[PDB]
Amino acid sequence: GRDEGCKLVTIGSGYIFATTGYGIALQKGSPWKRQIDLALLQFVGDGEM
Amino acid sequence: SVWFEMMRVYNWNHIILLVSDDHEGRAAQKRLETLLEERESKAEKVLQFD
Known part of the structure; x- marks a missing residue:
C-alpha cells in the first residue's frame, strides 16, 4: 500500500497459503485468559477493531 | 474450596x-x-431438590 509506483504486488490474497492469525500467548494456566478473550471479542464486536 | 483444592490434588476436572x-x-x-x-x-x- 506504500509501494513506490505500485510495482511490488503479491499474487492472490491468501488462497493457496497457510492463512493463520495472530493472538496473545499466555502461560499455561494464566488467570487473565477469559478477560482478554472477552475483551478481544468486545473490540471486534463494535467496529473498534 | 478445599474440594477445588482436591481438583488441584488429583488434577480432576469433571464434577457433578x-x-x-x-x-x-x-x-x-x-x-x-x-x-x-x-x-x-x-x-x-x-442438582437441588427438597
Whole structure:
C-alpha cells in the first residue's frame, strides 16, 4: 500500500497459503485468559477493531 | 474450596454438583462457579431438590 509506483504486488490474497492469525500467548494456566478473550471479542464486536 | 483444592490434588476436572439443601446450596453453587471461573470451567450438572 506504500509501494513506490505500485510495482511490488503479491499474487492472490491468501488462497493457496497457510492463512493463520495472530493472538496473545499466555502461560499455561494464566488467570487473565477469559478477560482478554472477552475483551478481544468486545473490540471486534463494535467496529473498534 | 478445599474440594477445588482436591481438583488441584488429583488434577480432576469433571464434577457433578448434588446439594439436597436449598438455602446454603445456592451460595455453595455460586462459590463453586466462582472458583471454576479460574480454570474457566463449569460443572457438568447441578442438582437441588427438597
